[PDB]
Amino acid sequence: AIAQLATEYVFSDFLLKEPTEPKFKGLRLELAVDKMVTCIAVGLPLLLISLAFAQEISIGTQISCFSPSSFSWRQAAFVDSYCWAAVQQKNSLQSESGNLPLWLHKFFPYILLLFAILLYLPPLFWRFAAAPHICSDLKFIMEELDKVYNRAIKAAKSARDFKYPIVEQYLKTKKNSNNLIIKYISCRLLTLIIILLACIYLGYYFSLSSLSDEFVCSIKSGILRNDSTVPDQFQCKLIAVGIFQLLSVINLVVYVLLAPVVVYTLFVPFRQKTDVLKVYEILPTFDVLHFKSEGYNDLSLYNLFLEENISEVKSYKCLKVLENIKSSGQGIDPMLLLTNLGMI
Amino acid sequence: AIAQLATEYVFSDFLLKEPTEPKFKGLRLELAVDKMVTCIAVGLPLLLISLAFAQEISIGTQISCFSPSSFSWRQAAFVDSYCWAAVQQKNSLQSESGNLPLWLHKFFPYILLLFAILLYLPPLFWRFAAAPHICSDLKFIMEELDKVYNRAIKAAKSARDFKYPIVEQYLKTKKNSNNLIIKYISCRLLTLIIILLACIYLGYYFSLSSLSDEFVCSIKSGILRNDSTVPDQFQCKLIAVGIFQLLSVINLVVYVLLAPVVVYTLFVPFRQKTDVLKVYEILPTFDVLHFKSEGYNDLSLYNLFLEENISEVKSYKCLKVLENIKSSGQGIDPMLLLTNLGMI
Amino acid sequence: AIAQLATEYVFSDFLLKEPTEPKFKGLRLELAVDKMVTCIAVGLPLLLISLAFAQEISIGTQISCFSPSSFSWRQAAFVDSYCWAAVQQKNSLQSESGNLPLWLHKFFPYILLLFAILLYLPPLFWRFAAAPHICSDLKFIMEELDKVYNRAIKAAKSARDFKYPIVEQYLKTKKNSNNLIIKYISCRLLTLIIILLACIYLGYYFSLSSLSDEFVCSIKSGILRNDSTVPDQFQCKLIAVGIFQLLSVINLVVYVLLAPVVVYTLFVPFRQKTDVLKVYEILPTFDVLHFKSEGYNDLSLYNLFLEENISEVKSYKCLKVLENIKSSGQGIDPMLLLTNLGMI
Amino acid sequence: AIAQLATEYVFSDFLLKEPTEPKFKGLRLELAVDKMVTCIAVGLPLLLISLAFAQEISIGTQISCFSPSSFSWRQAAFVDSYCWAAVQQKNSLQSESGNLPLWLHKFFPYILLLFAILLYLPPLFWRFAAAPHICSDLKFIMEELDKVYNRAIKAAKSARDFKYPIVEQYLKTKKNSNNLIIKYISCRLLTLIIILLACIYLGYYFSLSSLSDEFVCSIKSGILRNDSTVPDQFQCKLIAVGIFQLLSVINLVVYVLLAPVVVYTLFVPFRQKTDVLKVYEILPTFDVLHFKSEGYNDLSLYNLFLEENISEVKSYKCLKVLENIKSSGQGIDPMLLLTNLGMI
Numbered sequence A, B, C, D: 001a002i003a004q005l006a007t008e009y010v011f012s013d014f015l016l017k018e019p020t021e022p023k024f025k026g027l028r029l030e031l032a033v034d035k036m037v038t039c040i041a042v043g044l045p046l047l048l049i050s051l052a053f054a055q056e057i058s059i060g061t062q063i064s065c066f067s068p069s070s071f072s073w074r075q076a077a078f079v080d081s082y083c084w085a086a087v088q089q090k091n092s093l094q095s096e097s098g099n100l101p102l103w104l105h106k107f108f109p110y111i112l113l114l115f116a117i118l119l120y121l122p123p124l125f126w127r128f129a130a131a132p133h134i135c136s137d138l139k140f141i142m143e144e145l146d147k148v149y150n151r152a153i154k155a156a157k158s159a160r161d162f163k164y165p166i167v168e169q170y171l172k173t174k175k176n177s178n179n180l181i182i183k184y185i186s187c188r189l190l191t192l193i194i195i196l197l198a199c200i201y202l203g204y205y206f207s208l209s210s211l212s213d214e215f216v217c218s219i220k221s222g223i224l225r226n227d228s229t230v231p232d233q234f235q236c237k238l239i240a241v242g243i244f245q246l247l248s249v250i251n252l253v254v255y256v257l258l259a260p261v262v263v264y265t266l267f268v269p270f271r272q273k274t275d276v277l278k279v280y281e282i283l284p285t286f287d288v289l290h291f292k293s294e295g296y297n298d299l300s301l302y303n304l305f306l307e308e309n310i311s312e313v314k315s316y317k318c319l320k321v322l323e324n325i326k327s328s329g330q331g332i333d334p335m336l337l338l339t340n341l342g343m344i
């Protein structure tokens, strides 16, 4: 049913499942824009495949050949199945557009599934090769931030009654290596390349004459060659090709809307904005240094992932509360922090 | 079965699922009127699609063409499938109303699913882009309110035997920025625009002549062109078009009933009523200031979400009990609060 | 449906299920490259089998024989089923390519399933015969590393206020025996051999004339032998053979892309890189000795499995944080370790 | 679908389910070679049955009879069903090979299921009659070994700062009785006998003429006896008999590969190797005596089950670590044990 496919592929959490494992607990490991680009680019061809053969849009078989009236039921079934299998054998069928449109019309679901798989591959490579590396580091950074917050408020609490910037040094180190960022821009670049190839294929397929689904087929190989009761050629038509073209144009539109999103995603430093650690600079136990910007290096990627997963950090939440209050400038940062009383 | 679709789409918790995650625990993050508008505007086209092809309302195929009596079974099947695929090819079919009604009749389920998806998109954008931002802030506000209540009753209990309005300052800050409110009114405005476009389309479709489902179809392209045994044209009829129109008028009625609800939702300040924090003004540890009204700013949105999710706050419940008792004015607020004894 | 098979075999965690048992908790026991090689080499033939008979690619029966027009419906059904069963009996059918292509065309799904099973067998033998042996040892090594880290920081903490390298001696012992490594390279070698045999078979099958699916069949054994109403021979065609060849070439391409991966996997010492225990050499309670390289011995296999599962080790994570910071060389290892304060 | 059966019967944990009960927690109670022999010998006939009627290998009905052209559709259906039911009634059908091949061709799935059930019976008898007896004893032995290890390290720890070999005496007692071992070799012997009978049957069935699936059938009992419009005899063919023979040869090959495995399993003392308790002899609280070898007695069976389930024993793991280190002979057993510090 149409509504079942709708639920399964947009309303269900299709490709939105969090990693079912206690190693990454609440950690996203895939940027929201990347998760939605993957969800679209993968589920849309699948949803379109499932629609192209919805039981109410499909009239029946995928091909019909119009055997003569003298032909029995089973002879007509043979003609249909023969021509269906004969869209490959170029000698049997004669089509005005060519044999390539026939191949594309028969194997359109396979090609869409191929595009879905190829578009799922880069997110899978990211989830397996580079997601744990960033997950461990991000979990460690969040733990260290919570610890420095607790120590700062404990020092402030003792005042109301070591000191090494380890996380800052770790991020300074991340500023050097660029392995994770080249992995990220490589998976994004393969996603963009596959999306553009899919756009090219879908634009070509939609550009077909729309009469290329009608091909002349001749069951005259083998012992049927010199047979006389069988006519020389049959007029076959590939049903559901109009549906294929109408769905291919939808896929092409969505994909050419998605390609600018991927291209923008490709520029990872430009997206690093609203410096997340700047809110921590108001802590005594934390050095006054953001030092996170301007590079095609893993530091910018970590900045993005921190900007995403930082809302889970309670210390960040309270510090941002104080920072927003500081916009008015009524009281003072350490006083409001001591008032806070939120170690964990 | 009809009853299965009924269960799935009204009696089941379709699109009423709470976010399956411990980040938002009992927090709604979608106003009840917005949740019901989404549920209706999305499930109604899906429920209608599923009804339009219920096994007891569908007689069989979606098209029937009445081949001549001389035609065999398979030749008639070819005529049916050809004309089904030929509602697209404008050269083959001749219809009094035009080819556009034929397109709309064949692809009515697809268009309804498209409307369902487009109507689901703004709630999805709200759930992903702006729901966590409001969720963290609302959870922090509820925690701070419980804390101030506990501190107030502890001070009162010590009397029977810091002091910074942090949440008030946070809300004062929210009064300034308007990012969340423009996100909210933007998703609501896109919902209204898509609902109005759906109303326009459904009113047009229902306005079709009701004989536009009968079209004359000619299987005479290719080698069949100069064939003589095949008649010049066939009288095809698109079954289940009357069902499509009867369901389109239902969808249009429900949508023109839903559009005023969305328009009213669009006026977020007007809906901010029954000042929820006013009940907290009777606490000594809480400054005597509501300061939440009159603006197209995120403060009004936070007021709505607080009015919704505030029933989960135990301190709010007890304070509202005292406030309602105060209507009689028998005793006194601090005495009844000390009697209360409900820290958590 | 195509999309259902897509989900089940690429988007679902097919053959990615962690061992459902508390004996191995978070331990991989299968290298990521080996897990992906198994997933591909097993799920691809299964996914291809499921595609070759997707309800929208299949026109109907797998064989059609074109009985004469005088034949009744049931007589034509008999001819179809007889020839289907007669691709085996070499006396009945006469084919230009031979009877072997006919056998291969009828039993192509069985042969692909056979290849899937044979390719699943070596990973199963590894999971049952050699996975627990390495699992117990790896869990013990991780526990001992956490213990030595805790003891080192406790000694450092006492300074701020036994001693036997047991794990080093255990690994030195592993350096001697080679049972696990010969088991590993044997399962990998059988995987490579079966992949190469599958490549050979698929390249042969795809090389078939593409007209070998058309065979002449004669229902003239038994009492039908001297019967006259039945014609001498029927022109049968095996539908879905073009689909079989198009899928066999896909399987062959993926398999010849997979074979270099298996060959590279076969060289286990070469893959032992980024010495994982080198990060532990900065501990006083740990002897300054890596001693893990250069051999076709179980030590290299344990090095690979440690490199994989070591991210679960918290002590390793903190030590790698200190080691990366040491790249700048600002402070000192023991001071930063004492600052660390992460016993568990 | 083929791939569904593949998953269910090889890739799923079919007949690999651990006993769903807290009485045996992590205890195997079935030797790995016995578990795999059972899995193969049971799932292979089931997987073959499911394949023999895969929807893409089955052309349709299991029998086709070729009624005359004058026969109506329902008369031909009657002939087919009559001959299908008439492979039993020996008077009606005349076959060159005999009626026994016809019986075997009709009831091949039943015979394979019968073999699967009979091969599942001995493992079931072992799981119910003799598995709890060995489970309680093995759990007690593991608990006693952990206890003696704890007591030995506690005595060693007190030195760094009763005494009855109960488990040794228990095993000495097991050395006497042979009930469990005769139960084990009896279930293995019945498994071997049933496997050999299945090999004999499958080798016979595969040896059929391959034209025994074509039998002449005569619907001429009752009032049809002297009827004239019905022909004297019909040429029926049992479709899917070639598939049955091709699958029977596969089953026979796998079974004659499995029979040597069962025969080797039958020699339980020979398999008792790598004396597991020898690693415990380095404990002071444990007497220096293995005393486990050379007998057709329950002690050898317990040795096998201990060798299997001993990896769950933590004390055994640590002791084996020390024993492997002792190969180099650098330090000393009690010193390294005291260093160990792994009571539980």
Ligand SMILES: CC(C)CCC[C@@H](C)[C@H]1CC[C@H]2[C@@H]3CC=C4C[C@@H](O)CC[C@]4(C)[C@H]3CC[C@]12C
Pocket: A196, A199, A200, A201, A203, A204, A207, A256
């Ligand atoms: C990502 C964006 C740019 C994609 C836009 C669609 C493009 C790729 C499509 C739309 C129209 C298409 C063209 C339409 C017709 C023809 C003529 C044919 O003989 C060769 C292919 C060719 C030349 C097509 C190539 C692909 C094409 C240019």
Ligand SMILES: CC(C)CCC[C@@H](C)[C@H]1CC[C@H]2[C@@H]3CC=C4C[C@@H](O)CC[C@]4(C)[C@H]3CC[C@]12C
Pocket: B196, B199, B200, B201, B203, B204, B207, B256
């Ligand atoms: C939200 C509310 C206002 C929706 C009410 C339904 C509206 C949009 C419907 C109801 C009747 C419809 C009209 C009925 C008939 C025609 C004539 C046709 O040649 C062009 C479209 C046109 C002019 C329709 C346009 C859409 C229409 C005005």
Ligand SMILES: CC(C)CCC[C@@H](C)[C@H]1CC[C@H]2[C@@H]3CC=C4C[C@@H](O)CC[C@]4(C)[C@H]3CC[C@]12C
Pocket: C196, C199, C200, C201, C203, C204, C207, C256
């Ligand atoms: C792993 C790589 C090398 C596999 C490449 C595919 C190989 C195995 C394929 C591709 C073309 C195939 C050949 C194509 C045609 C023939 C002629 C035939 O009468 C015998 C088999 C033979 C000779 C095939 C043998 C297998 C073959 C060589």
Ligand SMILES: CC(C)CCC[C@@H](C)[C@H]1CC[C@H]2[C@@H]3CC=C4C[C@@H](O)CC[C@]4(C)[C@H]3CC[C@]12C
Pocket: D196, D199, D200, D201, D203, D204, D207, D256
């Ligand atoms: C476990 C191993 C030894 C099994 C090997 C298969 C054996 C049991 C098979 C293979 C060939 C078979 C023989 C083939 C043909 C005949 C002739 C027939 O008139 C009586 C049965 C008899 C004599 C079969 C008996 C069983 C048989 C010997």
Ligand SMILES: *[C@@H]1O[C@H](CO)[C@@H](O)[C@H](O)[C@H]1NC(C)=O
Pocket: A222, A223, A225, A226
């Ligand atoms: C069919 O008859 C024609 C007559 O020209 C002949 O050329 C051809 O070889 C024949 N084919 C068969 C299958 O007999």
Ligand SMILES: *[C@@H]1O[C@H](CO)[C@@H](O)[C@H](O)[C@H]1NC(C)=O
Pocket: B222, B223, B225, B226
């Ligand atoms: C069909 O016959 C007509 C006769 O006028 C001719 O014009 C047309 O080209 C023919 N078409 C085919 C397919 O032969």
Ligand SMILES: *[C@@H]1O[C@H](CO)[C@@H](O)[C@H](O)[C@H]1NC(C)=O
Pocket: C222, C223, C225, C226
């Ligand atoms: C069929 O008739 C032919 C005539 O030559 C004869 O040789 C053969 O034995 C007959 N077969 C049967 C089944 O009667």
Ligand SMILES: *[C@@H]1O[C@H](CO)[C@@H](O)[C@H](O)[C@H]1NC(C)=O
Pocket: D222, D223, D225, D226
């Ligand atoms: C059928 O007719 C024959 C003629 O010989 C006779 O012997 C037989 O008894 C009849 N059977 C029935 C059912 O009338």
